[PDB]
Amino acid sequence: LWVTVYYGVPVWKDAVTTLFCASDAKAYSTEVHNVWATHACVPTDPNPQEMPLENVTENFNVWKNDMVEQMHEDIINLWDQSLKPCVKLTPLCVTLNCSNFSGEIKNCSFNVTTGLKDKKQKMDALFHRRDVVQINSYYMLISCNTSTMAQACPKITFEPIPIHYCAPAGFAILKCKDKGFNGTGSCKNVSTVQCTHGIKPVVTTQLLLNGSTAEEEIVIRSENITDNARTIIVQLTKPININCTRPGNNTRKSVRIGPGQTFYATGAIIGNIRQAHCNVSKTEWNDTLRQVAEQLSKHFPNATTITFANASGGDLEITTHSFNCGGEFFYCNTSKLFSSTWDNSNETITLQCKIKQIINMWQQVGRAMYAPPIQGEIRCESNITGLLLTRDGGANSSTNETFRPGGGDMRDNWRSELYKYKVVKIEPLGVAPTRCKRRV
Amino acid sequence: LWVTVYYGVPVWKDAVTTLFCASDAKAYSTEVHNVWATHACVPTDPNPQEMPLENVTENFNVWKNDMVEQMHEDIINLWDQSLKPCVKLTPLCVTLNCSNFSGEIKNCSFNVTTGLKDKKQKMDALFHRRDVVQINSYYMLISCNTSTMAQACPKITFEPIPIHYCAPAGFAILKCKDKGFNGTGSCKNVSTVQCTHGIKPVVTTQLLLNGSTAEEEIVIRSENITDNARTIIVQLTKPININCTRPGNNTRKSVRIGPGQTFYATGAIIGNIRQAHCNVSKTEWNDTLRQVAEQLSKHFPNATTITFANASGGDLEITTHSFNCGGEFFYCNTSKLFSSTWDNSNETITLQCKIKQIINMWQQVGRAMYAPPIQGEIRCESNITGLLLTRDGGANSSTNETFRPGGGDMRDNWRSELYKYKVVKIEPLGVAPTRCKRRV
Amino acid sequence: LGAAGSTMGAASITLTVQARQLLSGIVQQQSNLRLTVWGIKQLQARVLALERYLKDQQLLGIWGCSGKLICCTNVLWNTTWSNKTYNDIWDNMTWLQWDKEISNYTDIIYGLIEESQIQQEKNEQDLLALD
Amino acid sequence: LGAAGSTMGAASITLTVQARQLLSGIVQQQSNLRLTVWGIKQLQARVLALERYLKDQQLLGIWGCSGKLICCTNVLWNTTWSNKTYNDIWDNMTWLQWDKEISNYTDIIYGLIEESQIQQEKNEQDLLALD
Amino acid sequence: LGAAGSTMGAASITLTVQARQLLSGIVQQQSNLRLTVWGIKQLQARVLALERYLKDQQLLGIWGCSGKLICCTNVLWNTTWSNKTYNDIWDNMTWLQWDKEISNYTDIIYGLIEESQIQQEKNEQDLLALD
Ligand SMILES: *[C@@H]1O[C@H](CO)[C@@H](O[C@@H]2O[C@H](CO)[C@@H](O[C@@H]3O[C@H](CO[C@H]4O[C@H](CO[C@H]5O[C@H](CO)[C@@H](O)[C@H](O)[C@@H]5O)[C@@H](O)[C@H](O)[C@@H]4O)[C@@H](O)[C@H](O[C@H]4O[C@H](CO)[C@@H](O)[C@H](O)[C@@H]4O)[C@@H]3O)[C@H](O)[C@H]2NC(C)=O)[C@H](O)[C@H]1NC(C)=O
Ligand SMILES: *[C@@H]1O[C@H](CO)[C@@H](O[C@@H]2O[C@H](CO)[C@@H](O[C@@H]3O[C@H](CO[C@H]4O[C@H](CO[C@H]5O[C@H](CO)[C@@H](O)[C@H](O)[C@@H]5O)[C@@H](O)[C@H](O)[C@@H]4O)[C@@H](O)[C@H](O[C@H]4O[C@H](CO)[C@@H](O)[C@H](O)[C@@H]4O)[C@@H]3O)[C@H](O)[C@H]2NC(C)=O)[C@H](O)[C@H]1NC(C)=O
Ligand SMILES: *[C@@H]1O[C@H](CO)[C@@H](O)[C@H](O)[C@H]1NC(C)=O
Ligand SMILES: *[C@@H]1O[C@H](CO)[C@@H](O)[C@H](O)[C@H]1NC(C)=O
Ligand SMILES: *[C@@H]1O[C@H](CO)[C@@H](O)[C@H](O)[C@H]1NC(C)=O
Ligand SMILES: *[C@@H]1O[C@H](CO)[C@@H](O)[C@H](O)[C@H]1NC(C)=O
Ligand SMILES: *[C@@H]1O[C@H](CO)[C@@H](O)[C@H](O)[C@H]1NC(C)=O
Ligand SMILES: *[C@@H]1O[C@H](CO)[C@@H](O)[C@H](O)[C@H]1NC(C)=O
Ligand SMILES: *[C@@H]1O[C@H](CO)[C@@H](O)[C@H](O)[C@H]1NC(C)=O
Ligand SMILES: *[C@@H]1O[C@H](CO)[C@@H](O)[C@H](O)[C@H]1NC(C)=O
Ligand SMILES: *[C@@H]1O[C@H](CO)[C@@H](O)[C@H](O)[C@H]1NC(C)=O
Ligand SMILES: *[C@@H]1O[C@H](CO)[C@@H](O)[C@H](O)[C@H]1NC(C)=O
Ligand SMILES: *[C@@H]1O[C@H](CO)[C@@H](O)[C@H](O)[C@H]1NC(C)=O
Ligand SMILES: *[C@@H]1O[C@H](CO)[C@@H](O)[C@H](O)[C@H]1NC(C)=O
Ligand SMILES: *[C@@H]1O[C@H](CO)[C@@H](O)[C@H](O)[C@H]1NC(C)=O
Ligand SMILES: *[C@@H]1O[C@H](CO)[C@@H](O)[C@H](O)[C@H]1NC(C)=O
Ligand SMILES: *[C@@H]1O[C@H](CO)[C@@H](O)[C@H](O)[C@H]1NC(C)=O
Ligand SMILES: *[C@@H]1O[C@H](CO)[C@@H](O)[C@H](O)[C@H]1NC(C)=O
Ligand SMILES: *[C@@H]1O[C@H](CO)[C@@H](O)[C@H](O)[C@H]1NC(C)=O
Ligand SMILES: *[C@@H]1O[C@H](CO)[C@@H](O)[C@H](O)[C@H]1NC(C)=O
Ligand SMILES: *[C@@H]1O[C@H](CO)[C@@H](O)[C@H](O)[C@H]1NC(C)=O
Ligand SMILES: *[C@@H]1O[C@H](CO)[C@@H](O)[C@H](O)[C@H]1NC(C)=O
Ligand SMILES: *[C@@H]1O[C@H](CO)[C@@H](O)[C@H](O)[C@H]1NC(C)=O
Ligand SMILES: *[C@@H]1O[C@H](CO)[C@@H](O)[C@H](O)[C@H]1NC(C)=O
Ligand SMILES: *[C@@H]1O[C@H](CO)[C@@H](O)[C@H](O)[C@H]1NC(C)=O
Ligand SMILES: *[C@@H]1O[C@H](CO)[C@@H](O)[C@H](O)[C@H]1NC(C)=O
Ligand SMILES: *[C@@H]1O[C@H](CO)[C@@H](O)[C@H](O)[C@H]1NC(C)=O
Ligand SMILES: *[C@@H]1O[C@H](CO)[C@@H](O)[C@H](O)[C@H]1NC(C)=O
Ligand SMILES: *[C@@H]1O[C@H](CO)[C@@H](O)[C@H](O)[C@H]1NC(C)=O
Ligand SMILES: *[C@@H]1O[C@H](CO)[C@@H](O)[C@H](O)[C@H]1NC(C)=O
Ligand SMILES: *[C@@H]1O[C@H](CO)[C@@H](O)[C@H](O)[C@H]1NC(C)=O
Ligand SMILES: *[C@@H]1O[C@H](CO)[C@@H](O)[C@H](O)[C@H]1NC(C)=O
Ligand SMILES: *[C@@H]1O[C@H](CO)[C@@H](O)[C@H](O)[C@H]1NC(C)=O
Ligand SMILES: *[C@@H]1O[C@H](CO)[C@@H](O)[C@H](O)[C@H]1NC(C)=O
Ligand SMILES: *[C@@H]1O[C@H](CO)[C@@H](O)[C@H](O)[C@H]1NC(C)=O
Ligand SMILES: *[C@@H]1O[C@H](CO)[C@@H](O)[C@H](O)[C@H]1NC(C)=O
Ligand SMILES: *[C@@H]1O[C@H](CO)[C@@H](O)[C@H](O)[C@H]1NC(C)=O
Structure with a gap:
């Protein structure tokens, strides 16, 4: 019986360190400087060494994984690093003598400043109804009395780029390869990796786009099912093909409220006056919704009913589908999707979408960003993989069950990609008794 | 006779490295973000290991300790990090058509900017006489022609928080535990620590508040006594109980000179029109002052006289007692304290105090800060522990001796907490001859 | 980390x-x-x-x-640090569940390790060669 | 740093x-x-x-x-690096006042230490085993 | 870096x-x-x-x-890692042109080095003393 030291024993503990970026280096010599990749993200490994772990029984926790918070912090930070140097839209909160455009969109007239200060600029522009409000009638940009408006540079894109969050030596990322994996608890098949897979920072509400795909059955994950306050997130197994288009052939006009302060606005568009919309195949949607009702009945009585209704109340991001599409921010009327009733036992649907240029996401009072116009008709397509549902709560139990779309927090989107990940720190110091002994 | 290497010999030398912060982590989930603790300061050790050192004769130097400068640099830096993102008070230097309030305080009327730019804001406010000057008469904020005024955020507090400055491995902090310790010179009782004790960055002039307490006799420390240009600093052994109150029930009004630029001013106060003041127990003050005269006679003839007079000339910070009190800056008429004469052998006194909202401390031409108003009557209490005195200088020697309060530098306040500290670097490489020798 | 689930003898x-x-x-x-x-x-x-x-x-x-x-080393294994044998430890348990069983006394052992030997053995060793 | 004030023999x-x-x-x-x-x-x-x-x-x-x-090591202690004995050094002086007495020649000793032995002893040692 | 241009024997x-x-x-x-x-x-x-x-x-x-x-070490030098003698390597070539000649197989040798000995020799060494 003698104590002995064994440096490098396969022993670890639960902790968290300072993770970092890892993205494949694309030159992009024509258009660079997206917010997430920045000037430099660490490159990835050409061969992703994924080592499986046998007889490893470990409990994962997605709803308490601090990596989601650290990502949510880095996202807001990366955004702020891309909004400071660009044009601070303070020489824009003027009285807008708007006329109804030939109704959303308005044709406004206003007085700004030229390259000179005393020399003022009598100019026009075109915006949406959710961009200005009245005080003919005179209008003012909505965020001029709340948060500081600042236009983003027309060079930095908002297209999501996959991020492979890693961990340094002494720390490891554990990946649970369980197909039928409830969000938390023990996992029979645990694997270890140094970095994660391709995760796109899809800033979207309700409908999750371009996310991960579950295996076999559509996985249902909620922190507490019987608690309506908890937001339920789903992960599909079959990606759909959704198409959103802004059929307005807009034009970009460049004014000079300088020096150096250039402002790009919306001029007389071409083509047709066609509002934003999206398309959903009614057959695949109805087919996918039926599989949802067959999966929701696993957390409810066998013979029951599942009711779908549109959004109740809240902001336009909580009620409408918020997402990016080529630079412009789209907000769609999802009422036509959620209006069905399901018991125990070839055209496409369209949704009216709105476009907003002055964004105030994350509800940060004090700062604001303006979306620069995008030329030509915009057409985007994605695969919807997740949804943020929400019960109604107080009612007679097991009678009827109603599910409404929610979006109380943006962190729920990062949970859709970090449900099978966990950071642990390696404790290589091992002490075990042996019949061996040292000298004198 | 053979040279031998001994790695890790108790040998050190005089140097200085990059120290850092150490403060106990308080959640403060309701009100956070004080300037000194910032978003994160390193936590402290639960058990402060203080190891004494025997037979260690070492000379300390407080007047040449570079830690005081490094702290003074970090303080000014920490302040600047808290003034940049907040509101830049440039849309405030307007003509103020002020009327005498129903005399210090003025009820002014002016034209600002609303959330719109062309739409101007006809508003009122209330400030002190030391905030604006004339050009009825029209007034302008005092710092509008000198330094850039910028309001601090109403979320960052100015309350001092104890800081435990440490040193990394290879460096050590030596603590002299001598009770009767002259400021510099040899110290019979030297101890070593990795971090200092609780040091509050008490930004104050003349009267030192919430400082360290000496032992036994009131310690007198001056770089050169016979040089009147050198500021003499004292350290009491008995803390007093001083109370400063602003009995004005002020109100905070929120205007919108946005976008995002919110400004909080002073509206119609409630309660009574009562100016700022402080209280000092005349008995304990007279008792403490007598002990000072008994300690000053140790650096002067036995049978002499000690004369006390108010401040001579200089800025209002050099003449009046500058300090913080719940957010507002107070400046008190200390003439009633310093007006006595002492040879060899139950009410309280009050001091008229003034309040200033536009501060220009450290005399940095170019930058300025505005103190946001504080709601409700303010009441603060502290323990005065030190004083910055100053002789008059040129006179007939040993006749009479006069002492006046001074405050030429703010570093003198950091000397009151760093008089018994010293950073040394460890030299572990030791070479000594032994009869031992290596092989061939 | 291939042998993280193997027996301590196999993992070693x-x-x-x-x-x-x-x-x-x-x-x-x-x-x-x-x-x-x-x-x-x-x-x-x-x-x-x-x-x-x-x-x-x-x-x-x-x-x-x-x-x-x-x-x-020279420090004795006190049996209060759990009673087991060589085979019950090295051929039937993994380092993970072992580290969990002994995590309670790792600090005490480290204190004895630095003092009892490498500071008594070496100090007496310095006084023996420095003679 | 407990023995910082003890004799070099005690401090060692x-x-x-x-x-x-x-x-x-x-x-x-x-x-x-x-x-x-x-x-x-x-x-x-x-x-x-x-x-x-x-x-x-x-x-x-x-x-x-x-x-x-x-x-x-093998480098001789040149007596110009102060004349003392084993007992006058290790049982009556502390490492602090010792390091002050020898701080003058620490550089010369380091130069001899790296050249005289570990570079002559090792180079001849490489030529002996590499034969 | 004085011997960067000398023969490998001289440079060593x-x-x-x-x-x-x-x-x-x-x-x-x-x-x-x-x-x-x-x-x-x-x-x-x-x-x-x-x-x-x-x-x-x-x-x-x-x-x-x-x-x-x-x-x-114990790993054999496979002759496909270039055929030369002791003198043709250590007394006529510099480490620079040598490192260029063997840069092709440095990876294979590192793999054998870590597995063949220090992992077989040490594992059998652990099973021998741990008996
Ligand atoms: C979920 O995922 C899907 C799929 O990943 C996302 O769909 C993506 O949407 C974004 C918009 O949000 C699109 O970005 C645009 O791509 C356009 C096409 O890019 C290519 O073609 C450009 C033109 O080249 C064309 O002509 C040549 C020669 O004839 C052909 O060979 C070529 O195939 C094209 O037909 C190229 O310039 C470009 O480099 C690509 O090769 C672009 O037109 C558009 O902007 C272009 O122009 C900008 C102005 O200079 C410039 O800044 C851009 O860099 C770019 O050059 C814009 O980039 C994606 O293309 C589209 N698909 C993919 C695979 O990403 C979907 O958006 C996502 N959902 C959400 C919510 O994000
Ligand atoms: C020398 O040292 C002395 C002593 O250390 C210093 O005296 C300090 O002065 C500062 C002001 O400069 C004071 O700060 C204020 O403290 C007030 C009291 O804080 C406590 O009470 C608040 C209210 O709670 C009350 O009700 C509950 C329930 O009835 C009671 O249990 C409780 O005891 C109180 O009676 C709490 O909210 C607070 O968290 C504390 O528990 C505060 O009222 C004040 O601001 C409050 O409100 C702000 C607006 O939201 C908020 O931002 C603040 O965080 C805070 O909540 C302010 O903080 C110190 O209290 C006072 N004492 C001490 C020990 O620090 C002296 O200033 C110093 N000298 C110099 C020159 O600095
Ligand atoms: C606003 O536009 C209307 C319509 O052209 C015009 O009658 C009115 O005078 C305008 N007002 C201002 C202030 O420009
Ligand atoms: C701009 O200013 C001119 C004169 O200063 C005025 O005639 C014109 O109506 C203004 N435009 C608007 C939109 O108010
Ligand atoms: C700004 O104005 C709009 C409409 O006038 C109003 O709804 C909003 O509340 C205002 N902002 C604030 C902070 O009150
Ligand atoms: C783990 O993987 C094995 C084969 O790789 C498979 O048989 C088993 O079902 C998996 N575990 C779970 C929970 O799916
Ligand atoms: C998922 O199911 C497992 C077992 O059925 C359970 O241990 C775990 O707590 C569940 N997770 C959630 C989030 O309900
Ligand atoms: C969910 O919340 C309900 C309260 O609405 C509670 O009764 C239930 O125990 C919670 N579920 C879990 C798994 O904690
Ligand atoms: C919008 O208003 C401007 C103001 O001069 C006018 O020239 C233009 O014809 C109007 N319509 C469009 C489509 O721009
Ligand atoms: C979206 O557009 C693509 C390309 O034309 C098409 O293949 C797909 O069927 C479309 N889906 C919908 C729902 O319109
Ligand atoms: C469409 O929905 C109806 C209503 O529940 C259902 O009866 C039908 O089977 C569904 N068809 C498909 C193809 O999903
Ligand atoms: C939801 O639908 C109801 C009727 O079905 C409608 O009255 C309500 O306005 C809709 N809500 C939204 C946010 O569209
Ligand atoms: C969304 O559509 C429903 C029915 O198609 C309609 O009742 C509702 O008013 C629409 N909401 C908006 C904001 O247009
Ligand atoms: C937009 O208008 C321009 C100018 O007529 C034309 O060249 C382009 O093809 C149009 N694009 C679309 C999508 O209508
Ligand atoms: C959507 O799914 C289809 C088929 O599963 C796939 O080919 C396509 O690449 C997916 N799109 C994205 C953006 O992942
Ligand atoms: C300033 O106030 C006085 C007193 O009300 C008034 O007589 C005078 O006209 C005012 N001047 C300006 C420029 O507002
Ligand atoms: C503000 O401006 C209006 C008109 O522009 C003027 O009547 C008023 O006197 C101004 N206020 C002050 C305090 O000068
Ligand atoms: C600013 O004005 C005040 C009073 O008019 C004056 O005392 C001060 O010297 C001026 N500032 C400078 C830098 O001259
Ligand atoms: C140092 O401490 C000892 C006891 O701890 C005490 O007797 C001695 O007076 C102290 N030295 C000084 C200078 O006070
Ligand atoms: C304090 O007194 C000691 C001895 O009386 C002396 O060596 C030292 O220089 C003095 N310090 C100052 C600052 O006068
Ligand atoms: C203090 O300054 C005076 C000159 O005013 C000088 O004579 C004296 O030597 C100084 N004291 C010390 C300790 O240097
Ligand atoms: C100060 O001036 C404003 C200007 O409108 C006036 O309404 C107010 O009654 C005056 N007095 C106070 C105490 O605010
Ligand atoms: C200050 O206030 C406290 C609390 O009422 C009291 O105990 C103390 O005596 C006061 N001191 C003075 C000088 O007013
Ligand atoms: C108060 O000051 C006077 C004047 O020096 C002195 O005679 C008296 O003893 C003092 N009393 C106390 C209690 O300090
Ligand atoms: C100091 O006191 C004298 C009279 O005692 C007075 O004339 C002078 O103004 C006072 N100085 C200050 C700064 O209060
Ligand atoms: C301070 O008080 C003294 C006497 O109490 C007085 O002479 C002097 O003018 C006062 N100073 C100020 C600035 O009020
Ligand atoms: C200040 O005024 C408010 C409003 O009347 C009152 O509730 C509060 O108690 C007052 N506080 C003080 C310290 O007078
Ligand atoms: C002031 O001194 C008293 C008694 O010495 C003590 O209880 C109190 O905590 C001290 N205040 C501060 C802020 O240190
Ligand atoms: C897992 O356990 C089985 C039997 O318990 C064993 O055969 C297998 O070797 C173990 N795997 C590892 C990696 O130790
Ligand atoms: C190995 O471990 C298991 C679980 O503790 C125990 O039941 C079994 O008897 C052990 N076998 C041997 C041979 O030690
Ligand atoms: C760990 O040891 C402590 C005392 O050494 C004891 O109180 C505690 O119960 C032990 N824990 C376990 C899990 O045996
Ligand atoms: C200090 O010196 C005394 C006698 O000189 C001695 O007894 C004591 O052990 C010494 N202390 C240390 C820590 O060496
Ligand atoms: C030890 O050192 C002191 C001071 O140098 C010296 O006087 C004394 O003789 C020495 N004693 C021995 C035994 O070396
Ligand atoms: C150190 O050595 C140099 C020459 O090696 C000599 O000039 C100097 O005086 C010496 N210093 C001491 C303190 O012996
Ligand atoms: C360079 O080469 C010459 C002859 O080839 C040789 O004499 C000399 O020593 C070499 N220099 C070095 C640094 O090896
Ligand atoms: C040394 O190298 C040169 C160039 O490869 C070669 O020609 C020569 O024969 C070699 N000499 C010996 C003795 O190896
Ligand atoms: C290096 O080795 C590879 C295969 O091991 C071979 O294809 C290649 O030609 C070699 N290069 C040289 C320069 O010998």
């Missing part, structure tokens, strides 16, 4: 494996060839990976086990 | 103590779990604490004393 | 020289006693100089050559 056959992915992070990113969030995150992570390594090699050094990955 | 009984508080700064702050003054100050301090350690272990390495805290 | 007489200017960068700048370009550039350079050193000492450690600058 791949200590180089745990030794490799603990110190070198400079093959994956010696530089990445600047105040971005990624630069600070990377630098603090790279420092930490060698910072942890130097702590463990430091403990082995002051315990007189600097050069070796496996060293035997 | 606690070299692990000076060895501990020289390399590990990661127990006190492995991370503190970002451009604040405190972040840069902390990071530069943590790097310096291991930076100094690696310099001294580097010198012991190129002097052929890598594994040991106490090593004896 | 100054390995301390290459060892010195590889780890210590703290004599040139332990601190320089703050977001300037120079501060970040300096700090990243200082970390890299010890980061590279720790990678090589790490490889020597997992190859059982931790304490030595020159260690002999």
